[PDB]
Amino acid sequence: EERVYQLLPKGDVEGMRELHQRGMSFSPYEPTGIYVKPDEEVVIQVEGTQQIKAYIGTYSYEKEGPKQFNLHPGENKISSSNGGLLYFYNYHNTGEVVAKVKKGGTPNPLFILGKHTTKDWKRMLAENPDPYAIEMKGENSLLTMHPETVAEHLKQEDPAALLKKHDEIINIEHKMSGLSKDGAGVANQGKHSIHFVEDWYTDDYMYATYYRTAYSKGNLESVLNLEELTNDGWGPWHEVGHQHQQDTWLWDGLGDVTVNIYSLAVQTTFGHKTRLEQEGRYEAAFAYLGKPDAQEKMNEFEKLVMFWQLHLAYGDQFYPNLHQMYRLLHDTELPKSDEEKKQMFIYMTSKVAGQNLIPFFDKWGLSANDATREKIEKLNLPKLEKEIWLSTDSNPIREKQIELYEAPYGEPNNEKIQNMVIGTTYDEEKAKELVQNLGEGVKTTGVIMQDTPEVGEKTVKVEIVDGKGNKNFIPVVVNVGY
Numbered sequence: 001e002e003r004v005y006q007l008l009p010k011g012d013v014e015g016m017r018e019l020h021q022r023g024m025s026f027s028p029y030e031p032t033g034i035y036v037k038p039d040e041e042v043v044i045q046v047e048g049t050q051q052i053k054a055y056i057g058t059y060s061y062e063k064e065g066p067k068q069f070n071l072h073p074g075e076n077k078i079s080s081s082n083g084g085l086l087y088f089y090n091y092h093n094t095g096e097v098v099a100k101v102k103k104g105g106t107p108n109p110l111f112i113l114g115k116h117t118t119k120d121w122k123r124m125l126a127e128n129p130d131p132y133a134i135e136m137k138g139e140n141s142l143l144t145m146h147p148e149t150v151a152e153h154l155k156q157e158d159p160a161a162l163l164k165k166h167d168e169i170i171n172i173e174h175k176m177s178g179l180s181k182d183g184a185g186v187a188n189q190g191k192h193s194i195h196f197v198e199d200w201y202t203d204d205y206m207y208a209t210y211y212r213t214a215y216s217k218g219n220l221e222s223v224l225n226l227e228e229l230t231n232d233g234w235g236p237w238h239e240v241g242h243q244h245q246q247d248t249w250l251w252d253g254l255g256d257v258t259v260n261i262y263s264l265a266v267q268t269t270f271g272h273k274t275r276l277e278q279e280g281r282y283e284a285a286f287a288y289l290g291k292p293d294a295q296e297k298m299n300e301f302e303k304l305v306m307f308w309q310l311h312l313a314y315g316d317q318f319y320p321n322l323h324q325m326y327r328l329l330h331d332t333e334l335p336k337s338d339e340e341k342k343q344m345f346i347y348m349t350s351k352v353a354g355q356n357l358i359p360f361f362d363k364w365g366l367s368a369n370d371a372t373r374e375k376i377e378k379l380n381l382p383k384l385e386k387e388i389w390l391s392t393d394s395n396p397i398r399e400k401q402i403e404l405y406e407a408p409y410g411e412p413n414n415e416k417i418q419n420m421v422i423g424t425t426y427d428e429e430k431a432k433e434l435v436q437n438l439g440e441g442v443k444t445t446g447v448i449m450q451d452t453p454e455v456g457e458k459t460v461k462v463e464i465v466d467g468k469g470n471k472n473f474i475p476v477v478v479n480v481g482y
Contacts, residue, residue: 004100005032007052007090008191012477013211015459016190018451019475020179021246021327024210027142027195029055029087033110034101035132038083042104045075048097050090057084058144060197060214061133071099085133085144093477094414109147113138113163121158138163140170142195145224149198149217153224162226169233170194170240172269173262177244178320184409185464185472186327194240196223206235208242215239230270237263248326249345251338256300261307261319268393276305277393289389294365306364306389313388314353315401321352324405328471331425331449343372354402356381363389408466409439410474420478422455424448434462434476441467449473455480 013025036042036056046052051073057066057080066087067080085108090097109124109131116124134150136143136159143159143166156162170193174180179189195212198220206215213236215223222228222235229236241262250258264274276282285302288294295303311318325348335341346368350357356376358368368376384399391397413434420430428446435444447463458480461473 002100002102003032003034003105004098005030005088007088007097007099009092009094009096010090010191011093012091012459013190013192015475015477016188016192018459019186019188019327019461019473020177020190020244020323021248022243023245023247023250024208024243026190026192026243027211028053028089028091028192029058029142029195029211030089031110031135031137031142032086032088032101032105033108033135034086034105035108036080036083036086036105039079039081040083040104041077041079042086042101043075043077044071044099044101046071046073046097046099048073048095050092050095050097052097052099053089053091054078055087055089056080057082058087058133058197059195059212060199060202060209061085061144063201085135093412108132108135110135110137111159111163113160113167116158118158118160136163138167138193140174140193141166142193143223144195145198145220146200149220150224153221153228155225155227162224162229165226165229166196166236169229169237169266172266173237173240173244176262176265176319177246178323178405184407184411185461185474186324187405187407187472188475194243196236198223206239208239213239213243231272234263234267234275237266246323246326248329248335249341249348251341253295253300253303257303258307260301260304261311264304264308265311274308274393276301276308281305282392286390288365289363291365296365298365306360306366308393309360309388309391310349310353312391312393312396313399315398317402317404318352321402321405322348324407325352328473330447342366343369346372347376350376350381351379352402353399354381355399356383359384360389406470407472408442408464408470409437410442410462410464410472411436412474412476414477417457417477417479420448420460420480422450422453422480422482424450431462434478435464435474438464439466445471450480455482 013028017025052071054069054071055066064082069078109128134145134147174189197212197214199214200217202216222233241259244262245259281301285305288298335344346361386397388397413436426446431444431446445463445465450460459475460478465471
């Protein structure tokens with residue numbers, strides 16, 4: 001027969017990662033529900049002008065990593081020694097690409113939310129007894145699991161409710177990161193989903209890396225059981241949070257601290273008490289509240305306290321604004337060491353809050369130097385009027401809640417990938433031609449920023465600004481060269 005695919009332009013995962021200042025990429029996978037046997041050839045033709053990429057094998061699902069393929073337009077034939085599930089990758093930002101599989105491959109269960117009913121699901125399982133894998137695709141999530149594991153932990157008649165909840169969790173963490181589906185620039189979440197994989201070939205408990213999050217055998221209950229995902233899902237919340245964690249305020253000792261900021265966000269949004277409160281981490285942390293070497297003698301979960309206190313003090317809009325402001329940093333102001341990251345955080349949080357937070361950080365053993373103190377001083381920020389360093393979830397000593405950052409709107413010049421010499425940080429005219437559809441009173445500054453100075457079809461950032469002084473970075477695809 002013939003299975004055809006309409007592959008919408010999803011964009012580049014690495015481009016969004018650098019834009020978001022995140023440490024690992026989201027998933028580039030577009031599931032097909034086709035399984036390719038080892039050393040079996042598949043015939044796929046690409047109808048259209050643009051080319052696409054393909055995968056055989058699933059990240060963290062087999063012993064060997066997946067094999068990547070560069071598919072040129074028209075008829076194409078590829079094969080893989082290890083075999084595996086077929087995926088496509090339309091890394092372009094515009095133009096849908098038609099890809100039809102007319103030879104090779106075997107049907108593999110793929111449930112798609114908002115497209116398949118319980119009837120389709122029941123039929124899907126019956127037609128494919130004991131399959132290679134079960135795949136369940138939501139709006140923002142992809143699940144690749146072993147069938148026996150799904151049979152054990154899926155407590156509904158279809159994966160729909162499970163996929164709805166996974167998307168909700170992901171949307172919560174996107175929001176906490178100041179990322180939205182229709183955001184512009186540093187507020188654009190991108191069009192790539194988060195991948196959840198059952199890994200039978202690792203000893204790690206749970207982990208997160210590039211392109212996916214993974215869960216070792218025996219530890220999938222909180223991923224597939226809807227009730228456990230909602231009530232005891234700290235695991236998957238944490239791993240998803242790890243893919244949101246931005247490095248610019250991640251110094252040594254925060255690796256398993258700031259990730260849980262997103263975890264606490266999910267836990268409270270579902271109407272539950274915080275892990276800090278239920279483990280009494282507050283009382284333990286307050287034992288170091290004032291100590292000169294407090295930060296050194298505190299553990300990972302104790303340091304988490306001061307981060308959550310900022311959220312409770314200035315409302316749900318704090319960390320969304322903080323994430324965005326960090327993405328707007330120019331190359332020269334990016335912190336390049338743990339010490340600089342610490343000092344930067346004191347300044348950035350103060351600017352977001354709109355208050356001098358130096359005494360708050362002083363109490364938690366994070367002292368600002370004279371340069372930082374002076375830099376904050378020039379902002380003429382009002383003092384703290386309340387002691388927010390004693391704040392808990394059972395005691396919300398808030399401050400003035402702040403508004404959400406309104407980033408100026410702009411679009412890439414997807415009409416033609418232009419030229420730019422590597423190392424270009426300022427060019428008034430080329431920058432103007434790189435963007436489209438600017439908001440009222442919105443213009444380019446001429447500032448251009450490539451996070452990782454590489455030559456080729458790479459993503460660079462173009463700075464825009466409105467009348468209020470607010471700025472944004474518009475990600476555009478440019479042909480960089482020597």
